[PDB]
Homo-oligomer: A and B are copies of this chain.
Amino acid sequence: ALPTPHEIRNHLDDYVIGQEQAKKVLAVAVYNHYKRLRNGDTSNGVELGKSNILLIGPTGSGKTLLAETLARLLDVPFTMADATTLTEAGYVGEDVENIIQKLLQKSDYDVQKAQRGIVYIDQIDKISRKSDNPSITRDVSGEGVQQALLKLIEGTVAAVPPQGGRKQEFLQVDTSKILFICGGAFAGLDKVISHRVETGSGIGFGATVKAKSDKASEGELLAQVEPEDLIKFGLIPEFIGRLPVVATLNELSEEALIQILKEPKNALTKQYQALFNLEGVDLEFRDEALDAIAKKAMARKTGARGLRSIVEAALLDTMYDLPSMEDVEKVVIDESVIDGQSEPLLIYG
């Protein structure tokens, strides 16, 4: 039979931690995509609507991770394109149509199986207009890209070179039923929402002066986002109208980082453990060291991806000398090693 939101969410939890609201949106969309196509031409409520998804969150939150993990369990075709390389009006870079061409490579040129596929885009913020007002001069990597996607998302015919061609054979593929999952960490959006939400903008007695460092929490600020906020960022309202659904993620909690290194299967702790497993050497990571690493990572404000700098900087000396050493069966890294005031203990056979 078909899957369910509880079953699909249980799978994503194995690879993703600390994202409750984000998993709910993707589960309903995927669960609803099978319903729309299955009911196509068989339901009296013809011309079923569509609802794309627009993910938003800080860096290292798991946006690109969800698209990869989703393809593992997803049956229908899936792709991972990028907005940065697209170019409007057939310029030097690739065109919008190239997105559909990549889908056929994974679908084996199955048009009937390609129309029911899913599409994902990363780094959507790169095409945002730098200024709120429309640019006076033409743009090749901004607003124009949004314009070309309008007819694509809603639904339009497309041209795809079947084999050995770039620009006399074209395969028609509708796009009214194709799903699009856009995502990108919009930089600087916190400043725009503060002007709109705080509204203080004053120095006098009556005007309020928010106490330094106890305001505009990124997690609580993105939750209050609205489409009008994105207009001041640079996006056009016509583009946002094509993506009604919006998902607000949260920044990694200190407790979440401890779980990300233990509960997931692809955690960094498990990765390094396998790196030394072939070397005939074990590894250990006590809880006293994980909680200490969380404070260092959050200070970097880079996300989960800024964790290797704390680990590799500590195990630099150890890895540089471990291969030369012999009769080494186990390595232990206590909390002190992380601070740099001690050296990791070694166990010999």
Contact = CB atoms under 8 A, between A and B. Distances in A.
A312 B51 contact: yes
A52 to B, nearest CB: 9
A134 B130 contact: yes
Nearest to A58: B237
Nearest to A306: B241
A132 B188 CA distance: 11
Given A89-B93, A137-B130, A305 B241 contact: yes
Contact of A140 (B91, B156, B238, B272): B91
Interface string A233-264: 00011101110111000000000000000000
Interface string A132-168: 1111111111101001101100111101000011111
A280 interface: no
Per assembly, the copies of the chain total: 2
Interface stretch (A25-33, A193-201, A330-338): A25-33
A28 B320 CA distance: 6
Contact of A4 (B35, B123, B313, B323): B323
Contacts of A317: 24
Contacts of A43: 274, 277-278
Contacts of A308: 49, 51, 244-245
A82 B164 CA distance: 23
A87 interface: yes
Nearest to A105: B172
A37 interface: no
A317 B244 CA distance: 16
A241 B65 CA distance: 15
A181 interface: no
A76 interface: no
Contacts of A32: 275, 319
Given A5-B320, A320-B5, A49 B126 contact: no
Nearest to A102: B157
Interface string A86-104: 1111111111000000100
A105 B49 CA distance: 27
B134 A147 contact: no
Given A147-B123, A151-B84, A316 B28 contact: yes
12 contacts: A5-B320, A43-B277, A59-B238, A80-B156, A85-B148, A91-B141, A92-B95, A133-B191, A164-B168, A187-B238, A227-B302, A244-B307
